[PDB]
């Protein structure tokens, strides 16, 4: 008759997990290499996916922490003394403008909350509430997008969470300054409904529930084959 407090939904699902690692440069190059983008979802990290897909419906708040580490870049014309690096982190709600390049107008939109962060301080954090039209997120959706019974199968538009975009505020004239971003994601005030059997087959697609047939368990020698045995000894005489 010992405690069960560690098996509750809160203590089971509120563990921070690293869900994205990206890199971006601070100088000339291909524009797509000068910013980092991520669409918020729980279907790309298999370890977190297996935990969220024990329940059919979920309702939680998001807490996102960004760890940013920058270093100098080898080449010619190295910077002898740089003041400090500042980074801009922008959260785009569902339906907001999304940048197609760095130094775009969407970076200065008043509907997108942004964080300006200087090197040396504590990691930046933000919290997003339960932002959806429906009354819950749904891990499994059996249905179509249009009512013609045709379209994308298994896609629901009621569980969009937005995007995260990170770039360098500074304009650098001497040298390049590569930076690396890590995203830590955590649910809070979690509520879950309608439990489901955990998955057996390995994941094959982030968008689908497709699978390969897998054996229901691990093989055994015989039906009456108990595990191994013990040799004769002082107790067994």
């Amino acid at each position, epitope marked *: 008759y010992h405690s069960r407090t560690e098996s509750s939904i809160e203590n089971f699902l509120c563990r921070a997990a690293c869900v994205y690692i990206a890199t971006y440069a601070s100088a000339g190059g291909t524009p797509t290499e000068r910013y980092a983008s991520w669409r918020i979802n729980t279907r790309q990290m298999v370890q977190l996916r297996r935990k969220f897909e024990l329940f059919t419906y979920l309702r939680f708040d998001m807490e996102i922490t960004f760890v940013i580490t920058s270093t100098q870049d080898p080449g010619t014309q190295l910077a002898q003394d740089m003041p400090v690096l500042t980074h801009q982190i922008m959260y785009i709600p569902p339906g907001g403008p999304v940048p197609n390049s760095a130094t775009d107008f969407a970076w200065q939109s008043s509907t997108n909350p942004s964080i300006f962060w200087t090197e040396g301080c504590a990691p930046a954090r933000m919290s997003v509430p339960f932002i959806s039209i429906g009354n819950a997120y749904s891990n499994f959706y059996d249905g179509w997008s249009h009512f013609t019974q045709e379209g994308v199968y298994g896609f629901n538009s009621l569980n969009n969470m937005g995007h995260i975009y990170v770039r360098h505020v500074n304009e650098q004239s001497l040298g390049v300054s590569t930076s690396t971003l890590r995203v830590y994601f955590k649910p809070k005030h979690v509520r879950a409904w309608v439990p489901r059997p955990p998955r057996l087959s390995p994941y094959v697609k982030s968008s689908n529930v497709n699978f390969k047939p897998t054996a229901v368990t691990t093989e055994r020698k015989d039906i009456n084959d108990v595990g191994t045995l013990r040799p*004769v000894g*002082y107790t067994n005489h």
Partner: antibody
Amino acid sequence: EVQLQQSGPELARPWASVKISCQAFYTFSNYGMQWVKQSPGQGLEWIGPFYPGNADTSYNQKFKGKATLTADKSSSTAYMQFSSLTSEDSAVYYCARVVATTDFDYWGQGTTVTVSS
Amino acid sequence: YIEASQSPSSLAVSVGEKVTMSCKSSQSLLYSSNQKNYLAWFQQKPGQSPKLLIYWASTRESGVPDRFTGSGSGTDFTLTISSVKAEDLAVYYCQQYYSYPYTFGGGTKLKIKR
């Protein structure tokens, strides 16, 4: 290199009790005494172990309900009784002793139990 | 420990002469409740496995020729062969299976006299 002896080979008759004794030169604590069957036709087959210091006696299923075992630790003599004796059971019975839980170190001398009906 | 003493020497007689031997036990070998004598006369061919002749001192083992007859009640135990053979060379023990331990006899070589 300790020697080992037994009761000895005697010419018996069918359905006549033959007790094959075995001498000892050790103690009687958590050790073991047993035998085999030395017949070229039947190869080597154990008959039953006896465990001084453990009070355990077992027989093979091939002779279960036919043979019995007894011993006297103080007297240093171990019996291996047999019933419903046949004529093809003749073998050079070897007395095996183990001073360990799991080993076979010292072997016997040799005794014959051949009969004529 | 309970042991038994065989004859001081071997048979050392001619071939074809009946031989009588005795086994002197150091303690009683009769269980009065069952009237059973727990001792047997053994025989070991040199190089092979041993094999007894008669068990319980009154029941000859099946397959044993009629030449061997074991007797003796109480502490004493004897045996008789009405026809000794030159192909029966072995070591004769008188082993007891009464109580722990199962001690053997003393040994008896079938030597050469011819």
